[PDB]
Design a binder for this molecule. Sequence first.
Ligand SMILES: [Mg+2]
Ligand SMILES: [Zn+2]
Length: 329
Amino acid sequence: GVKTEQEDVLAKELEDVNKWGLHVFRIAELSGNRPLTVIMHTIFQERDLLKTFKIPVDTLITYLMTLEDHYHADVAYHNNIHAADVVQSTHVLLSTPALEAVFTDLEILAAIFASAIHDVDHPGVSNQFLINTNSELALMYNDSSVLENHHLAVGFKLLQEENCDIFQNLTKKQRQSLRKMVIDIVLATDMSKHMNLLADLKTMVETKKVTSSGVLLLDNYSDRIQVLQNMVHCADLSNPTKPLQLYRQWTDRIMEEFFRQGDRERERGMEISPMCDKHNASVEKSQVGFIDYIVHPLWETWADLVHPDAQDILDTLEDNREWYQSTIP
Ligand SMILES: [Mg+2]
Ligand SMILES: [Zn+2]
């Protein structure tokens, strides 16, 4: 009735589940390539979500293993490890002092479930690639947020497999509200929405109201969903805010995926996508442009929203940017 020795070492790595910089690659190795299942299970137990939503534990495990199996192990970045990392990063952002007791259990479930499914069945190429190749997915979704529409349909469709309906005890009212929030969050992970999300978060920082002692005031769906959308988008673009040991591994994986897309774009004579040309690549310059144009404006605005809970994350991001700028041949 006692853990194996590998399960013990896994359990001791999982004591960091509440911290920015969890060794998620190590958890992936120790769990037998089950990072998403074991991190989701830990978070569901820690936030008491099984008792609150009357989720049978065998149903939760069956769904999570099924969801994890529909991530592609032959994809370097957009796989179950990336899903697990965004879940755990969203878990940490939801615990920020500035957001203490703001969100309902259903909103918390929506943000975590959204994170878990947000990239499921990613084929390791971009929307633009799927549109330009006349792929079946681009035709199903009429070329509009093709991947993000697919991630949602799969995450939901998998609830219908044998003993997978983790929402079986929610009321129709709970399920309709959960589903709308999950759909709103995952569609907001399409980078084509980044500038609009960031504009709305900036507006929200300018007109920021707070409660008695810290803690934001969010008193309408538009505002509550905007913060949840920006939080998961922050978790999705969190790699450059992590310790450099972690960030680097993320950068190696994204560049593998992108160069592999570039190879397919070349070997068929298409325009080679930005950063996808392994012949003409400046990885260090790419990372500095990515931070200066996308990640830093986002995380700086988020840091403003939850002042000063995100100071160390913003500092780590600035250190990594200086590090990458300091290389640049
Ligand atoms: Mg995505
Ligand atoms: Zn993602």
